Amino acid sequence: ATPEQFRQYGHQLIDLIADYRQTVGERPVMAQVEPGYLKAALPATAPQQGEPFAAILDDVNNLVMPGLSHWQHPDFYGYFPSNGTLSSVLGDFLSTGLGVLGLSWQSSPALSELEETTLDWLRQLLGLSGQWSGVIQDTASTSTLVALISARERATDYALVRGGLQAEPKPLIVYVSAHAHSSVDKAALLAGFGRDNIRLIPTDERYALRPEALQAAIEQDLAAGNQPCAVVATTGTTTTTALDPLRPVGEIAQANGLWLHVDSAMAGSAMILPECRWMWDGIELADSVVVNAHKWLGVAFDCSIYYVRDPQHLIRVMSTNPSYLQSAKNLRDWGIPLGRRFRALKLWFMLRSEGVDALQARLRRDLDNAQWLAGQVEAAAEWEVLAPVQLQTLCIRHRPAGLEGEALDAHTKGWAERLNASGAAYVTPATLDGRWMVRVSIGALPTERGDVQRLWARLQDVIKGLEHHH
């Protein structure tokens, strides 16, 4: 397309996306197609000569829109939100249409310097001290790998410029809560740790790891000749949004020379709320922390924030130059990819356009709406909440009288799959304590108290065999 062909196409697409965001609630939250629907519906080869853009858009309405689960939906409650404020979407347009790449400062100064400013902007909004400095990764997954590669490198004296992992005399252990996200385990394994070497630490009544078990596990490996390396604590676990206690775990990791990396992907955003930073107490004792501004806060995916107190050790590892001294910026050296796009446009536009006053009320909205639905669920007979509601996620279940064990597990994913298939809401079944339950994660951008009331009505009715279509 010419730049003005593109501008005739630009305005048509701006309109299509504006009507989507407007009328999204009118659709089934989750896709109602079958595996193979699109591949069967598409050509088998690329076209030799270009095809008109109206042809695409037709295909976009007629083939692509029915095979979407809608994350930006008032009735989406699944997983954790993947929140896409239209101001940040407007930042992403500009980053793509500009076309620049950061391979170095010189290859575009405005990209790196903006990212430096906006990350410091948010560092302050989260309540973090001045010793913290951040970079945008693509995902928490990558971020925790960065942090476990950082952990490895600290405990092995930068072996990567020598024999690397296989020349180390002692197994490097990684200690995580038994409710830590599956990305934490993978990251260990991609950094070479071995499943054997990852000890899951048991949890408490509130599914938070017991520091007493950590220090038990840690003494036992020293009494085995293994070499403890790193702890990974989770502030807001995926199942129940449990809250690892980071001050006792941070004093342990400090007393034993281990890396404390904190996985605050989901609940990190709440730390712009001053009333919620009890959840983060101890975090100043941590070596790294990751928050997914592309989750709840509302910047469009991808935008994963990683903060270290020792950026000189990050640069040493990722630039594979351990002789480096900070006192004697190049985001190249702050993560895996040597090239980045202008994702700082997204943070900049959202932080500005909305304002910290809007971002605070929204998150406090999802917190307040999750206390409301927990109060109905507690009091309705036959219904129960299985975990504390310290964030905006509820672990709920319905209990027919007499119905225990496997049968109930079937009853629970049955109605969970029936509610999802109706189109009224999107919920994520998940296991807790060897039993199946159902998660309600409240925080999609347009989810307000009216929508949550409805969800509580569809939940009751789906058990009585009543399902709602649009």
Ligand X SMILES: *Cc1c(COP(=O)(O)O)cnc(C)c1O
Q: Could you list the residues known to form a binding site for pyridoxal 5'-phosphate, using ranges.
A: 140-141, 292, 294
Contact positions with ligand X (CB under 6 A) in 236-255: 236-238
Contact positions with ligand X (CB under 6 A) in 400-419: none
**Contact call for residue 439 and ligand X (CB under 6 A):** no
* Rounded Cα distance, 424 and 454, in Å: 9
Fill in the per-residue mask, 36 to 75: x = in contact with ligand X (CB under 6 A), - = not in contact.
----------------------------------------
CB of residue 81 vs ligand X: minimum separation in angstroms? Answer: 10
Nearest to 1 by CA among 54, 64, 61, 63: 54
Q: Hey, what are 123's tokens?
A: 């560092």
Q: How far apart are the first and last CA of the chain?
A: 38
**Contact call for residue 266 and ligand X (CB under 6 A):** yes
**Contact call for residue 139 and ligand X (CB under 6 A):** yes
Q: Is 261 exposed, middle or buried (0-12, 13-18, 19+ CB in 10 A)?
A: buried
CB of residue 358 vs ligand X: minimum separation in angstroms? Answer: 23
* Rounded Cα distance, 271 and 268, in Å: 6
Start-end of H helices in 319-355: 344-354
Q: Assess contact for 305 and 76: CB atoms under 8 A.
A: no
Nearest to 99 by CA among 378, 443, 345: 345
Q: Assess contact for 148 and 191: CB atoms under 8 A.
A: yes
CB of residue 17 vs ligand X: minimum separation in angstroms? Answer: 23
CB of residue 312 vs ligand X: minimum separation in angstroms? Answer: 26
Any idea which residue has 């990684």 for tokens? 174
Query: Measured between alpha carbons, how far is residue 428 from residues 169, 239, 436 in Å?
Result: 43, 10, 11
Nearest to 438 by CA among 386, 390, 373: 386
Q: Hey, what are 312's tokens?
A: 């000189």
CB of residue 331 vs ligand X: minimum separation in angstroms? Answer: 18
- Judged by CB under 6 A, the residue of 85, 112, 177, 234 near ligand X is 234
Fill in the per-residue mask, 280 to 319: x = in contact with ligand X (CB under 6 A), - = not in contact.
------------x-----------x---------------
CB of residue 403 vs ligand X: minimum separation in angstroms? Answer: 31
- Judged by CB under 6 A, the residue of 126, 140, 201, 455 near ligand X is 140
| Angle ∠(201,203,205) on CA atoms, nearest 5 | 170
Fill in the per-residue mask, 93 to 132: x = in contact with ligand X (CB under 6 A), - = not in contact.
----------------------------------------
Fill in the per-residue mask, 182 to 201: x = in contact with ligand X (CB under 6 A), - = not in contact.
-x------------------
What residues make contact with ligand X under the rule CB under 6 A? 80, 139-141, 181, 183, 234, 236-238, 263, 265-266, 292, 304
